[model samples]
Target chain A: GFFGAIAGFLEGGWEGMIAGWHGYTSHGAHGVAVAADLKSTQEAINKITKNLNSLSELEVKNLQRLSGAMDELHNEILELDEKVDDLRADTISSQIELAVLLSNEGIINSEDEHLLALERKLKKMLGPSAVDIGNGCFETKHKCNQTCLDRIAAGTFNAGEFSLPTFDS
Target chain B: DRICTGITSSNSPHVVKTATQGEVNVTGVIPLTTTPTKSHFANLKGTQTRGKLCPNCLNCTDLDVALGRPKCMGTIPSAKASILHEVKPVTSGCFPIMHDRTKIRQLPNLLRGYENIRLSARNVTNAETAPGGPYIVGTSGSCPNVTNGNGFFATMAWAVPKNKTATNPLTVEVPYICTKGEDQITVWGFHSDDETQMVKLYGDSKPQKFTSSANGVTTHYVSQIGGFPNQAEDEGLPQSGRIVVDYMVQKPGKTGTIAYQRGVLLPQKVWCASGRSKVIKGSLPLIGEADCLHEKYGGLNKSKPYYTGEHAKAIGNCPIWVKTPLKLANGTKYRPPAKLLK
Candidate 1:
């Protein structure tokens, strides 16, 4: 009977962390929707950070794993940005080459104003860094520090160091 | 009114002689035994019986105060009566012959009669000269006073050691005086202190004598034979022995018997081998010492009361030869029958 109580008490501890994080992220998500209230957005981010610190070790461990996956997603998103940049650069270069080829059999221009607008649209959609992807800053420059960041990114990230190292430490 | 009267011729005797103060003299003829006798001249200031001479007189001289003698006109011829010849000293010698000057005293009146008997019987006749012998004497006037027969008022018994033993008879003569009538005398020997066991050595019972006397006062003799227990077996000898004499007198037909225990003689120490001395004051002599030791060791502590000091000596420094005189629980008299003879 006593062991069951201890088991319930530990479960309750993890449940408290889960509930705190759930409320924190729920508020953070609302912060992104109010794009004009940056202070409220910062307040929501601070609340999410407080809740993350308040999480149990296991809760924090899972949060770190999710944060690491988010970091990877943010990295992938950065790689995709790179890929898009390289594709844009190559399309520009290829447009010159195709001009040469079209002069030789030239058909279309590679450096067009419409493509620059599309590149700007892609950068706005993916955001600039991992912190920007999470809509806030982090201790690490571009790392997904906790599961609270998982809402911003979609790839794997090494959140072990960036996530809350056991709240004890 | 006329105190004196005279006799007339018709009433007077035919021969009469009268006398006034110192004048007229009257003479009477003396008669022999053969003379006819009557009460005549019995009224002439004298009384006559059937004898020829006058027996008694109404008017006589003062010499007739004691009526034992017959009072007559002048003097009668003095004649020694035959009874006077019969009246001898009851015993042969002087009484209370002092044998031991230290042991006994010369009690003349106390031992008046018994000495002669002892002198004749036991040959203890020496009076003042003898230094040591048996001496028994009665106390003075211990016998009851009587008017009829003689009453011996007291008795004493004393003896010196002459082969004294439990069975040896130490005889002492007891003399008594009596009047003329049936007289009774009873005697027994006892320890002076203990009278219950009367000296059985004399006889099984007390010795009694009855005598009829006809003359005037007479002296009678009776012998008592008794001995004290000698120091032998346990119930052996006593320190002393005494003789008790009871004297009673009675007329032939008298009712009020006259008797009394005449006297209890002083105790005489039964001669013993070593312990025959007088009782000493603080310490016991050899006799009491031996007695106390005997009681302290051999017998029960009967001598406890008497053994006040000096290792259990007896009272009076004497041996316990007899029990204390027995007394009736109801206070009855302990002496034996003392009735007068009928």
Candidate 2:
């Protein structure tokens, strides 16, 4: 039976990108297990499918080939595990990148009513712990980042739970 | 923001002041056993049952503070989210955690009969130390593990050239997770010269103490997380896109030989019942007896978190290894079954 496989695999990385209201950023990636790309992987799976019928299961050598194939796919699946990690990057970077934007300029002590509205959002993202100055300002100050603001604007935030990364740790 | 730092090493006396994330974030223990291992984990020869001991070590604190177990978090750490006053920091050594015999061979705590096993096994022993044992072991307490597992990874050793110095030192690295690189990475080797065996490292300023054990298990603590990839259950990654663990070892005039392994990076699930404590400063935060911290989960990160400079945080910026697994993924991985008898 088919099972739920790879979804939302980031490539360039889940951190440091968002721009122009959103390059507002997230890089999409390589195959995670089920992607139709990667010819050899697909070829291997296809070969196994054909072998299951042509080759006798009783043969010891045939079993080894089957086992090797299984192991091959198993290791391939292991690669997908890393793809799921891209999902993890999403979980963390969304908050991390958002904080970077909030930490910039008048936001820390911004007085304009227009800026005041954003101050609240920054407060929600960074809480009271994050410092307004220094290089570590956007350093995942716990959470908060630029990517998130872009997503919030992109409507990706409202894409529903299905829109979130596929696998959970 | 309370940016949890990465598990990077440091130099000097201050680096020893651990738990920049929390007492339990990068800490854990496993049931120590001398029994024969039964099977190969993921096709590798090693311990049978070494689970992520830090996250699953306990549910209560000695300050009599109650805590949440990491496994059941459904997610994970907010200390001030509970307690008023901060409990003491949990030490990084062996302490009896639970009385659940069923959890036996699984959780850390020294087993009853094995009490003197770490000692009884050592007589007037000067530790026959392996020529280069980058062997695998579990990081359950305040020491690096070089026991359990079979003779597989022991094959990966370093040959530091003579006249070693900080400028040019032997750098060791850990690759992935699971038995391949258990939660606690370890190495057991000696310098050609014993007395002047000065093992200097680069990273933080605080100096870390190394220990000795019998049965060839050396108590060396050189755990650095490779990205937040510490997945105790079965999956994760090192943000480097590679979990890099390196400790430049120098042995003065003599050559320093090292057996290396990557620490098993698993997400720390439980948060200390209180917020990051500004009180516990200095090295050796997790202190007490053969058992360190009188309890489990402890926090030291003041929220003034640092990894900005040379300081390394226990949990790191992201919660990769800090997150809990969806299920119990390790079996016959680190903790092997106890031998029935002689």
Candidate 3:
């Protein structure tokens, strides 16, 4: 036992040093494994974020494309309306021209000149008169209350009540 | 309580007539006139001073129909006097209660409270990206649910009467301007007292008139060329201009029940211009009125191609003929003074 203790002192605690070295090597290996796991997790999260951003962009584009299509459709409808307007005008012109030609040829003395003339005059007159009358009636009612009040204040006698003779007996 | 009473009478029954005269005098403890007096004399003079005069222009007989009582100065016209629906004044007060005789003027052409319908866009989807682009759904004046599909809404206000049961059948006119590919109009008829009780649309169903659902969903179409020959199948809207709708109050049930009907003119975005092209040269083409050749294309000068495929394509082939009185063979002969200066 004495000889072994002397040998241990000489070796300067070699066994304890060796055990400490072994512990440090295992700890280092554990740290490497943890770092690798953290990197993989971060990469997975990055991939998800990138995909989400792309999906959001796609949604925005789809909406834009839909609205643009609607606008285009609306424009086409306007153009169609304009075309219809022209066709109506053409039909009306053809009818008038044919009527005038028939009258000039004396095939039919049907277009009453007096009635036509009267129609023009009436168009000018009745249209305006109708508008004016409607305006007058509308304006009159709005002022009804005010007119009643005004009439009341203007008259000296109790217009609504029993009448009093001008001279008192 | 009558200290003294006297009666005066004339032969005629109606006060509106020339010779109609009648008076009744009762003498009591209270004097006719007293400052800050209590237990007052109920006399015609007091009624006159108390603003009891009729406000309408109706005669005595007409007043009976209006008031549902014989209140025309205690008598009616001779026509209504004999076979009278005799309704005596039911008041214990000294003065006889006067009917509001003021007649409200009937306005056939007046668009009453129609302008109060306003359309505004809301729920504007993708506002930031589009920067005031077309909205998905819009709301209007009173109805938040009635939305324009592309995110717009409208509101309407009606000039409604209060308290008095509407005995008379009333007519309403709603004037609107349509400037879109298609517009949606929600005709709302509601009682002023209750929000739920909507007045029924006058008619059941007419092709070009108003269409309504069983739940009283009324829809009207205002179009420039609706039901035209070629465009009959196509869902087309009228050109951008003024369109007036005249609706009569439904009878048989709505009588004596006051209700208000208003059209909420929502912005139906048709593919049309906002402003109407005017006809300064002659009278503009009237919507729903016959237009002559000159009036139809009056705004365009004769120098411009009035007809031809190219012109038709440009102007949408809307006009069929060109009638220029100035270009007539007898131009200068019967020219009016107004045209000579030009």
Could you say which candidate leads in TM-score?
3
Q: CA RMSD for every model?
A: 73.5, 33.5, 51.6
Candidate 2 C-alpha error for residue A147, in Å:
50
Model 3 alpha-carbon drift over 4 Å, by segment: A1-73, A107-169, B1-116, B119-320, B323-342
Candidates 2 and 3, the one with greater TM-score: 3
User: Cα deviation in Å at residue A117, candidate 2?
Assistant: 16
Candidate 2 docking quality: incorrect, acceptable, medium or high: incorrect
Error of 1 at A62 (Å): 99
- The numbered model that scores best in DockQ is 2
lDDT of 3 by residue, B225-279 (tens): 1222221211122211112222222211221111222221211211111211111
lDDT of 2 by residue, B50-166 (tens): 111122334322111111121211122211111112212232212122111111121111111011111011111012121222222212221122352221111112223232333
Give the worst 10-residue stretch by lDDT in candidate 3 chain B: B326-335
Q: Write the per-residue lDDT of candidate 1 for residues B1-342, one digit (tens) a residue.
A: 000000001111112111111111111111100211111111101111111111233233111211111222222211110000111112111111112211112111111211111111121212212222322332212111233322221221422223222322222322222223322121222223223333422222343232222223222333233454332211112333333222222223332211111122322211101101111112111221122112122112232211122122112222222112111011000112211111
lDDT of each: 0.21, 0.21, 0.21
lDDT of 3 at B114: 17
Q: Chain A TM-score of each model, in the order shown?
A: 0.18, 0.20, 0.21
Worst 10 residues of 1 chain B by lDDT: B1-10
